[PDB]
Copies of this chain bind each other. A is one copy, B any other.
Amino acid sequence: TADGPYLVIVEQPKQRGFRFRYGCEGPSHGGLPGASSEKGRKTYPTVKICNYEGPAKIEVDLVTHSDPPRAHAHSLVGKQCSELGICAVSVGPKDMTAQFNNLGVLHVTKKNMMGTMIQKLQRQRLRSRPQGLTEAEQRELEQEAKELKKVMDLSIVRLRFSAFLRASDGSFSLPLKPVISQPIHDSKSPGASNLKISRMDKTAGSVRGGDEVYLLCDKVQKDDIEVRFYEDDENGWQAFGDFSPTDVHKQYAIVFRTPPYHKMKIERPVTVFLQLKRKRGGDVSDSKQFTYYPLV
């Protein structure tokens, strides 16, 4: 069961909106916010130790998106942080919640990746033999690095919180179970981010369809994009906008013809939803309302 002391993520990071920064760009470009942040009501990743009150140390580090949680080529930078990418905070005996309001992600160069990665692999399995390392092991350490650089997603990271309860000594030597956050996408990384409908020229139509709408959106590859018109309650009607890739303008607009509603001769207007859908994927835009009107 839960019974023993455990860490819990009180407020997860934003899965979508964060830009990873390269070494060149700067260290002061803004902190990884919470999933609940708004331009004014800002929130930061928070975690809490439950089933214990007292002095404690929580540390965060970047791990892979892969279930087997291996350390990431990327490093966390900030006021609280080590050079190895490890951020450490102290919870007072009163307040067992730790906020991380200044977390940045240093984006490793593909020319950098292996050296930066063996450095980490060293630091990590050098306490396993603290005097030195064998060439045999250093050959095989480079072997992990290589096989990891071939599969490693540099667009997606996960925060890993490792909580440590300070003992009687003064030593923060007791471990808790490590808690991994949900994935974090690089917003300035290849597409597949948050589909957005900025505005559309019409929000209404006849039940017949064929009415041409100009839809302004965030970047949508002609390849992977549709215009899904659906009702959710009513056993899920679904139909699509009538557009050729030529009709998707510089990946920021769609000129499409509305589809007909499933049931003609409706006595009165029927409100439906439309949304962007990646057919290749399954992601969706924030859906807007559309009204279908009756005939003559």
Contacts and interface: CB of A to CB of B under 8 A. Distances in A.
B214 A201 contact: yes
Interface in A247-273: 249-250, 252-253, 255
Contacts of A216: 214, 249-250, 253, 255
Contacts of A249: 198-199, 216, 252-253
Contact of A252 (B201, B212, B252, B255): B252
A103 to B, nearest CB: 28
A28 to B, nearest CB: 26
A153 interface: no
A132 B218 CA distance: 61
Interface in A218-272: 218-219, 249-250, 252-253, 255
Nearest to A219: B250
A254 to B, nearest CB: 10
Contacts of A214: 201, 214, 216, 253
A216 B216 CA distance: 9
A203 to B, nearest CB: 12
Interface in A14-34: none
A198 B201 CA distance: 16
A274 to B, nearest CB: 16
Nearest to A251: B252
Interface in A45-69: none
Contacts of A212: 201
A199 B255 contact: yes
A213 to B, nearest CB: 9
A255 B212 CA distance: 16
A160 to B, nearest CB: 35
Contacts of A198: 249-250
21 contacts: A198-B249, A198-B250, A199-B249, A199-B255, A201-B201, A201-B212, A214-B214, A214-B216, A214-B253, A216-B249, A216-B250, A216-B253, A216-B255, A218-B250, A219-B250, A249-B252, A249-B253, A250-B252, A252-B252, A252-B253, A253-B253
Given A201-B212, A216-B255, A249-B252, 15 more contacts: A199-B255, A201-B201, A201-B214, A214-B214, A214-B216, A214-B253, A216-B249, A216-B250, A216-B253, A218-B250, A219-B250, A250-B252, A252-B252, A252-B253, A253-B253
Shortest Cβ-Cβ A-B pairs, 7 listed: A214-B214, A252-B252, A201-B214, A216-B249, A250-B252, A201-B201, A216-B253
